[PDB]
Amino acid sequence: VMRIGTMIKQLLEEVRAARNRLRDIHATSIRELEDGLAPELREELDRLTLPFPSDAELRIAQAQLVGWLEGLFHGIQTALFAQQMAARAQLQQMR
Amino acid sequence: KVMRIGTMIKQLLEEVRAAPSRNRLRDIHATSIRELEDGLAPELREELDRLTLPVPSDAELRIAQAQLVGWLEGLFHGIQTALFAQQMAARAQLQQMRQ
Amino acid sequence: KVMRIGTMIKQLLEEVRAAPSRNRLRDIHATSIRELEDGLAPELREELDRLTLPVPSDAELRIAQAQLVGWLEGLFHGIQTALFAQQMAARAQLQQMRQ
Amino acid sequence: VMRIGTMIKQLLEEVRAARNRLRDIHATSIRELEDGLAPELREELDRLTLPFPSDAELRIAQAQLVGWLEGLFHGIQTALFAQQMAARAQLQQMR
């Protein structure tokens, strides 16, 4: 289930305007990505945030969050493809 | 495979963490995208349509580096959660067939 | 879906278990195959190429009924183990990415 | 992993010749299908065998084992297809 996929798209755009907002978005993304996670959450919430404030670190912190969101989308995406492609191969072994 | 993709990433991520240029950060990025486009048609058009992080200045580098960390980290956890979801969906479907 | 397939089977299996004809056992079979060929090209040629269990005698019926039980049971557990394998492969792949 | 798939094919043919052999094959099939199974094995080994001896019950018991093996193959097969098809749909949601 890729609800997360659609949310990444929308969350991606908000990534630009004129820091609480930035920190807020990252948090949203992580909560939606967690859904249900086992204690593995530690790694996902192990100082998994942007680095802090001066404008420099806000230009920086905001770039970090564009790549993070693109990464999730394409990681999810290629993994999803692997899945479809593996099931096909496994089947091509029918013969 | 998907394991091959993850382990390289873990590596590219450590390769950037300790950095100084304009060719290093651009290569790490190319490298990562070279790994994903393991036979997936023209959707490669999404990654191969640039999507590259924006004598260069010093501050400009830091900003670009930060974006790379997210890209590399995003790909890692994006895969990870696609995997866990795949595993949970099979779990559920098994319990539906209680018998 | 795959859950839809399993639950119908559980039902067809109980529909045969308590039987007396030559049209009942043939319908239960048709029914099961009608369920599998949920949009899968010409591989339907495998199931739709007869593959039907062999005024008929009495003993002949018992033999045919037994074969149906295996077919219905086979489809159930065949799915079940494809599901568990799918779930285990995702599990493993997750543990490879220890970090 | 569909090793089981290839074994079903081979095990399927042995299904005809001229009861220990019959009972032996079913057992083989179940062991190869178990690989690793959780306590769920009970259901798979809950009087999951052919019914016993007179020829009548050997014609019968052997028919049961042809369908069982065909069933496993096509159950595994369609489930495998579902898998590939679901991963594709989930992806078609990218847009």
The per-residue DSSP string of C7-54 comes to: HHHHHHHHHHHS---TTHHHHHHHHHHHHH-SS-TTTHHHHSS-----
Contact A54, B54 (CB under 8 A): no
Kindly list the distances between the CA atom of residue C69 and the CA atoms of B95, C25, C48, C79, in Å, as whole numbers in the listed order: 22, 10, 19, 15
Question: Is D39 touching C (CB cutoff 8 A)?
Answer: no
Residue listed under structure tokens 């004598």: B55
> Which of C37, C32, C26 has its CA nearest to residue C13?
C32
Which resolution, in Å, applies to this structure? 2.8
Q: Residue B86 and residue A81: Cβ atoms within 8 Å?
A: no
CB under 8 Å to D62, separation ≥6 — which residues? D15, D22, D50
Among C51, C72, C82, the residue with its CB nearest the CB of D79 is C82
> Which of B24, B35, B50 has its CA nearest to residue B2?
B35
CA angle D45, D47, D49 (to 5 degrees): 90
> Which of B23, B2, B10 has its CA nearest to residue B72?
B10
The span from the CA of A95 to the CA of B20, in Å, is 54
Contact C51, C67 (CB under 8 A): no
What kind of experiment solved this structure?
X-ray
Residue A61 class from Cβ within 10 Å (0-12 exposed, 13-18 middle, 19+ buried)? buried
Virtual torsion, Cα D71, D74, D77, D82, nearest 10 deg: -100
Contact A28, A42 (CB under 8 A): no
The span from the CA of B55 to the CA of B74, in Å, is 29
Chain D stretch 54-83, residues whose beta carbon is closer than 8 A to a beta carbon of chain C: 56, 59-61, 63-83
Residue listed under structure tokens 């399927």: D12
Nearest CA in chain B to A75: B75
Domain ranges across chain A = 1-95
Q: Which two tokens stand for residue D80?
A: 């495998």
For B38, list phi and psi in degrees, rounded to 5: -100, 85
Q: Which two tokens stand for residue D88?
A: 């594709």
For chain B, the three-class secondary structure string (H helix, E strand, C coil) is CHHHHHHHHHHHHHHHHCCCCCCHHHHHHHHHHHHHCCCCCCCHHHHCCCCCCCCCCCHHHHHHHHHHHHHHHHHHHHHHHHHHHHHHHHHHHHHHCCC
